[PDB]
Write a new protein. Structure first.
Lengths: 292, 303
């Protein structure tokens, strides 16, 4: 199945929601040519031991989420920003890989190397533990009955799994040094930051990555909880997901001004990147194909 | 001055009937030797001494009973880690019960690190310490926060999201995995999936039995404040929805590997057994659960 017949209307509805509840639009970070090459060279070095090449185009597709979904008004540490570019991208490769290619002995040291290059010692350990936890989770839940149970039971069980699985807990734990903002740092470290933003990131990603995922047998997508071929059921389900995003956004507005800017730029930036990037244009292309 | 007292007997029976149907295996209490209990209590007293308030042996024993009842003794391998959880649980319970004027991070964080370094190896000590630091910092920073109000009053979903950290269950998991030395459990503890799976089962039970105390102290972190407890129909509807939440989580817990699900279910059910037997939840204000207060004239010369 596919959600293509709903693409135009659902995009309009997401956009209407953002226009009313978030208003401020995300802004894209411009890296210099030098900066982008440093990021790509670090990405290539980290995945090369796994034996698969990743094209410059595929790296630029992956990196766009970081470019669009941070909070430029508040950025203090551009070395931390580059780290998030690299770490996001290389864990994206692992997400797209056949688990036969997962080699922890070769990859975990590369993740440590990245963290120690860009962060102070304490932040490096926090970022590295979160990266290690994410790639371990992605690996251990391929073909797991736990994943089946959490993804097929209810939206609540599913989003609970996604706090880690989508990578948002990792994101917050590698991004707080960008801002050096004490309250944001605490919400990152308790994972309240990831929990506040999981549904807004996941409902958007799930809608636009559905066609790819169902074609690959991937079950981690909330729209598989409804019959997408039943337009009535799909619309009621979609509305319930919009309601979840709105409630989260309204509660995010209770956080301090800087933290809420970061959280909302993340959710909205992810929507802008997702709806423009080649990764989500088609189910199988040269930036999203399974790495085998 | 609202209360769930009229519902106490029926709601206890309904929780018990749920456990008898869905969990079955009863929790079992760990017996510590006298020396082990004294080691724990001595470490608890040392850790809280810098904060300046005496804690009786009776109060420590009240706090420690949750660890004695809600771990998984079939699977315990590291009793040093188990003693650490006893101590860490207890001393963070004191912090939970304290007025925030008593909260001295400069004095207390080193004592948390000392406990962790005594009982865990170097990596585990860092994980337990960071989780302890995160919890006590969260408890303090949310005492008067608009964020806590928003999350606690909006919906059950926002509320249980706050409680993953606030009830202390993420801390519990991150300090408890060394007890079991079980790879899968360790991973679920470190992603917090373990905490997320068990939050509702712990929090719904705790909230029902701690409501009367919490309302009397103006504490808003309780899901039963989302309903009008004086309206029997509204209360029973809300209570039923919370039981459904517990049952859905328990059924998905049973998809985890056998040892991990044993530990998660012993935590949820053990907490219920301790909560429904312990003096801490028998009345709203007593000498094991009273607010630990800073005296306004602590500095006065007539002391
Ligand atoms: Cl999947
Ligand atoms: Cl409270
Ligand atoms: Mg994935
Ligand atoms: Mg994927
Ligand atoms: Mg997806
Ligand atoms: Mg309390
Ligand atoms: Mg508390
Ligand atoms: Mg309570």
């Amino acid at each position: 199945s596919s959600v293509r017949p709903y693409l135009e209307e659902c995009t309009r509805r997401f956009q209407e929601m953002f226009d009313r509840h978030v208003v401020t639009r995300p802004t894209k970070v411009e890296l210099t040519d030098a900066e982008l090459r440093e990021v790509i060279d670090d990405c290539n070095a980290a995945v090369a031991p796994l034996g698969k090449t990743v094209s410059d185009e595929r790296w630029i597709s992956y990196v766009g989420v970081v470019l669009w979904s941070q909070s430029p008004r508040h950025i203090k540490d551009m070395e931390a920003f580059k780290a998030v570019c690299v770490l996001n991208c290389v864990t994206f490769v692992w997400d797209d890989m056949d688990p036969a290619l997962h080699d922890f002995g070769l990859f975990l040291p590369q993740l440590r190397k990245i963290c120690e290059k860009y962060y102070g010692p304490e932040d490096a350990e926090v970022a590295y533990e979160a990266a290690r936890a994410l790639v371990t989770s992605d690996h251990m839940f391929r073909d797991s009955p736990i994943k089946a149970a959490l993804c097929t039971t209810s939206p609540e069980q599913y989003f609970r799994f996604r706090v880690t699985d989508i990578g948002v807990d990792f994101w917050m734990k590698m991004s707080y040094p960008i801002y050096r903002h004490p309250e944001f740092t605490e919400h990152a470290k308790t994972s309240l930051a990831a929990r506040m933003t999981t549904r807004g990131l996941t409902i958007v990603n799930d809608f636009y990555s559905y066609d790819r995922e169902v074609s690959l047998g991937q079950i981690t997508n909330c729209f598989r909880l409804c019959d997408v071929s039943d337009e009535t059921a799909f619309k009621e389900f979609f509305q319930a997901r919009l309601d979840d995003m709105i409630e989260d956004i309204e509660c995010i507005k209770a956080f301090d001004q800087l933290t809420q800017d970061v959280f909302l730029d993340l959710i909205y930036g992810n929507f802008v990147w997702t709806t423009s990037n080649k990764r989500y244009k088609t189910a199988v292309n040269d930036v999203n194909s399974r790495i085998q």
